Amino acid sequence: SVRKILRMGDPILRKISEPVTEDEIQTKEFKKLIRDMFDTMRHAEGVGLAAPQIGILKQIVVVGSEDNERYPGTPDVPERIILNPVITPLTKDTSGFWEGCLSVPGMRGYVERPNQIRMQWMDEKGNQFDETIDGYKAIVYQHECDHLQGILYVDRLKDTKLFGFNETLDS
Amino acid sequence: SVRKILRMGDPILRKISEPVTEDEIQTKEFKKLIRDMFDTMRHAEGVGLAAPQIGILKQIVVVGSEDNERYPGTPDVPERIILNPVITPLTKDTSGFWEGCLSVPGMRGYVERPNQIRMQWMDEKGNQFDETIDGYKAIVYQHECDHLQGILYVDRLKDTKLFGFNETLDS
Ligand SMILES: [Zn+2]
Ligand SMILES: [Zn+2]
């Protein structure tokens, strides 16, 4: 079901989320949470969503694009669940991008993150992964994994001069 | 009359405003602009307003409190016009405060500025001043004079962790 997304200024968004246990991924609740998250992410036309954005300090991330309106250009991102992620940059090369966040409504900010990272996670069935991601996917996983450590993209603005409300950015 | 206040993201808010000439302060227009500004500032329940906030790169600032709702606590600030201001800090002592801006709707950010400055300006009649201001007044004049150099308070956030939407800050 759709859930209330917390906005910037709420102290939760700044706390550290803790790991999900192997047991936990069987609980009826869990499966229902992942459900709500996806329902929520979709209703918001969002590209990804982290558990703490809805008030749950659990290392649970969900992504999924498909013709996303909010970030029109961006290539499609296949629905997937990311649990207990751990990212590591593999380069200093950085791709720029006007990031946005559902917890930071109606605004965009240019942010440069490394364009090639090594992420390690676990999924709903409990499978371990350790791949090297790059491109938009990398950009998305990083933005979303940051939430898990209490970090919002406004913390990484390249410059505060390149930050503002959507409406005016172009108009 | 009330005028449209530009929001953050509009390039004007980042440009430098130029000095007002002694002649200029007689023009019918000028007097009408100061009029609009005051009308605008009041309608917005704002404490101060800089010309560029309404799209005029002229060094014109206007302030005026009296039981302001937006920043409830704040002491009263007598209506006054500040032209071609030039501020200089007189101390490193800084008073903290959760600043807000009409060009940055519905948000607050903790900002520490020097609590005792020396400001020099000219008024509508063309009189030169050179006083030492302190307290809330100092805080207000600095915030507003910054606009004259293309600077918004989000550029001076003490920490991005202490920045967010009003609604949530307390709720
Ligand atoms: Zn976000
Ligand atoms: Zn302002």
Q: CA-CA distance, A38 to A49, in Å (whole number)?
A: 8
Spatial CA neighbour of B4 closest among B55, B38, B76: B55
Please answer whether residues A80 and A123 qualify as being in contact, where contact means their C-beta atoms are separated by less than 8 angstroms.
yes
Q: How would DSSP label each residue in A73-95?
A: SS-----EEEEEEEEEE--S-EE
As a whole number of angstroms, the distance between CA A152 and CA A156 comes to 8
The residue among B105, B104, B102, B98 whose CA lies nearest residue B157 is: B98
**Cα torsion for A151, A157, A158, A160, to the nearest 10°?**
-150
Q: What is the arrangement of strands in the sheet containing B163-165, beginning at the earlier edge strand?
A: B98-101, B104-110, B163-165
Q: Does B4 touch chain A (CB under 8 A)?
A: no
C-beta neighbour count of B73 within 10 angstroms: 8
The per-type count for chain A, helices as H runs and strands as E runs, is 3, 10
Confirm if B158 and B168 have CB atoms less than 8 A apart: no
Under 8 Å CB pairs connecting chains A and B tally to 56
Query: In angstroms, what is the resolution?
Result: 3.0
Cα Rg of chain B (Å, integer):
15
DSSP A155: G
Q: Of chain A residues 98-137, which have a CB less than 8 A from chain B?
A: 105, 107-108
Dist CA B160 CA B154 (whole Å): 9
Q: Is A155 on the interface with B (CB under 8 A)?
A: yes
Helix/strand/coil percent split, chain B, to 5: 25, 30, 45
Which amino acid, one-letter code, is at A6? L
B46 Cα: distance to centroid of ligand 1 (angstroms) = 31
Q: What's the rounded Cα separation, in Å, for the pair A98 and A109?
A: 5
Instruction: Report the structure determination method.
Output: X-ray
Q: Are A89 and A117 in contact (CB under 8 A)?
A: yes
Domains of chain A with CATH codes: 1-171 (3.90.45.10)
Q: Where are the alpha helices (DSSP H) in A22-120?
A: 28-43
> Of B144, B146, B119, B171, whose CA–CA distance to B64 is shortest?
B144
The closest alpha carbon to B87, from B62, B117, B115, B127, belongs to B117
